[PDB]
Design a protein around this nucleic acid. Sequence first.
RNA 1: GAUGUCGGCUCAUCACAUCCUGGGGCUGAAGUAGGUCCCAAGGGUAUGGCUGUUCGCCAUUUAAAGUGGUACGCGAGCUGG
RNA 2: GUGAAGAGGGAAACAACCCAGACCGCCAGCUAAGGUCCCAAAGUCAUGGUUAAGUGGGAAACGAUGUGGGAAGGCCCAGACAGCCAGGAUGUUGGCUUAGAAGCAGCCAUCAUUUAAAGAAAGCGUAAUAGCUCACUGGUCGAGUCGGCCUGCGCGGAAGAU
Lengths: 38, 176, 141, 94, 71, 164
Amino acid sequence: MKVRASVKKLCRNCKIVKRDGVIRVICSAEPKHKQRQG
Amino acid sequence: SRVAKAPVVVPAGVDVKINGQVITIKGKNGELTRTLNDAVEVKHADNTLTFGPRDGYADGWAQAGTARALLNSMVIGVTEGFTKKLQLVGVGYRAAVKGNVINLSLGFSHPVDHQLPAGITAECPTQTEIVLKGADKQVIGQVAADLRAYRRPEPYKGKGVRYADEVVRTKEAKKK
Amino acid sequence: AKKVQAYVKLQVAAGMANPSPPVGPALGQQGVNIMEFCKAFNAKTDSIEKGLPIPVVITVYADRSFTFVTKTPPAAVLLKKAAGIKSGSGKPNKDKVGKISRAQLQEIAQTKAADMTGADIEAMTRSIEGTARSMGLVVED
Amino acid sequence: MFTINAEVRKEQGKGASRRLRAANKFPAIIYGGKEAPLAIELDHDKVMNMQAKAEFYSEVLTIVVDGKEIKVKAQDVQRHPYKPKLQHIDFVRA
Amino acid sequence: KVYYHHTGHIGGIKQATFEEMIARRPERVIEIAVKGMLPKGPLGRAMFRKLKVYAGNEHNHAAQQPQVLDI
Amino acid sequence: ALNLQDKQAIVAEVSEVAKGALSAVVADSRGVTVDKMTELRKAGREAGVYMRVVRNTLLRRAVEGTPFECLKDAFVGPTLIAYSMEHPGAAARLFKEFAKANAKFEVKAAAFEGELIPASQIDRLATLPTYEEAIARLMATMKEASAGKLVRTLAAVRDAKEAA
RNA sequence: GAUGUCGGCUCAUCACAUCCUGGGGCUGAAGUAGGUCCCAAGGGUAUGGCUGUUCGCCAUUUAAAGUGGUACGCGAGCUGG
RNA sequence: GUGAAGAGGGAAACAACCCAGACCGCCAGCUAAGGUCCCAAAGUCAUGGUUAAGUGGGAAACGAUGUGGGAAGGCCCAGACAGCCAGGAUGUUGGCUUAGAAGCAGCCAUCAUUUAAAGAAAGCGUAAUAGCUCACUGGUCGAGUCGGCCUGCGCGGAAGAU
């Protein structure tokens, strides 16, 4: 994971889901997409 | 919201015991099957589970679909039993059950002491093949989930304990 | 997923499925043993000219027993013979390496007729049009 | 397409128009022909979410006020400095 | 909720979660919850010394005949 | 409203052919599988049978706006409907053509000239003698009723009187 | 009617944006190693020279040779270059 | 304007701010700005809406299927939405390239055909061929869902000498 800010959709299975007060990109195509914060 | 609207209509001979918010699902061929609904209010009827809003929460339909899903999963756990056969890829790892204890190796100098929750039981045909038996849909995956703690399907060559849906998918180097 | 598909694709010359490279890897990957396919394809290839690559589309059961439709040579092989061309252009539309009349096309279309599903001998012709277009033959009225 | 209503203006001036906008209502006039301009108040989010279809302006409007109907087309639009929200719209008889 | 202090030593703040403070020596969560509700120096010490909590559910106050109060 | 007409039209379109058919046959697949269907279209143009594959939402709304005979119980579950207004025996032959690379138990029912034809019986309709072979079995039936039955009874009462 | 300086020594202290071990994701990472990379102020955190030297160069240790502030910390502690 | 040339009230209080313009005395009462759970004088105020961040009660770029309401509108039992399953075809393993080169290694075609039906393909994927989800079709499926726009409320961005 990289911490970042602002979440964008990297692949067609990035669901993008809000865990606590930080939005995680979680994808189920590639493990490469895990941006931690939005 | 459509799966919050599902009337469930629980099967014959499943015992669903309602203390208002606390529900206990019992039957044959598994143990320790329960739910505490805290976000949503669940009425049973005779068997038609009906989902709506709980005091001190403002979110709606959101846990009412979960209540449907979680109560019915439990009901389905005691009736037939959801599939029970779990398994792992990678040489020299194992998950051989011996009683209440799961014996495996990780190169460690301590005994790993990986053991089953009281809400499951298990036995093994072979050292890489494990059959976990019970009627709670959460627990069977919670012990799998701990088994997976240092043995996740790796993102390159994919080795690990493999069961059901998992959100690591494996990836390649760029195409040849 | 059963991991089952109807009409799995293969293309191999009628005398060369005895070796594995002319069949390529795909067949093996869906688990049809290459020799067993080679014997079964040889029984149906004798009214077909030898060495002309035949498309063959297989439907497969669970137990990896397989069934096979053998077809008259591609519209692309026939079109190469009729135009006096060895090979297609390698660019569709922009590059010309020949021309085709409708009457040579309607006969290519009848040669495929029992494989072609179309409800008119004109629909069948219509289907092979884009196969001439890809290989640098202009389809002229 | 639209069948809408309007009221004739009770109050005029700057001080008067601002208490309508506090209440999420806004103003208009229907000019053209030989005859007077009919000054009117409208409701703001009645036409804001109609004008989501291009048909509020492309097709004429039925606007009924004290039982008078004359038929109308939209004209030039006044919007707030930094909000798209409608401060005032003009109309012509059609 | 981590109960901030700097008694005198070592780089950093030092801390304790509310959960450590209720599970072990349980008095203190409620103790430093009423502390800040009383005024300055002298009157705030004089208000405080009338209260006791002890550890919890281990009271010795049977003999006085305590008047019950619900909150 | 619908965005498209296809779902509302097809209800009228299916009731139209299916009151009219002299044979139609209602059969099961949930994913009819392409190798067989194309082989059934190829042949279908020889025989003059038409085939539509159609939803139970459409078929239910069809029964509701328009009355249907002897197929409307076979619409339940996943459904193809093949139908002929001409050569009724050929509609039934198409199911013996689909049975060759696929399963023969999948018919729920058929209708044939307003008669319910049950799933087992239709394999027999599909046997379809030619006109010369049809005339020849119509003669076997009349020569049987003529002289075969006649002796059959008189032997069966002669055996029975003979005592042990 | 005044908080009085640099470099260095002594003695320290606090911010973590951690020099390092430690737990862990990604990787165009096979494994190892690295790149990428989040948590974390708890603990340890080298020495001789030349120059008035902050900064420089060199020789060497250390698994390692950090970042910032303190009347440019600290003469009601030490120097007079 | 206020201080300078002003008491007293509030603000964690100052020189200027908000109320206001100290005659002195009165255990009198009201009202202001500012307050009303304890600190500390009064509301844990009533009625309706809404939120999980101590947001509230610290600031921008910026962005997203975080969360709700609303009216106007498309889809909306003639079955949505799109999950789950299953089909995903005919010329065609089109042309070039190659041992094979197949929608998805690369490039050009980017269509036509029986179709109630399956893009010569959006995304994945032994690196590629194979397999896979996907609309559309047929089972499950029997209700909300999506674009525009108004609007309550959220998010990270926002790490320091004590």
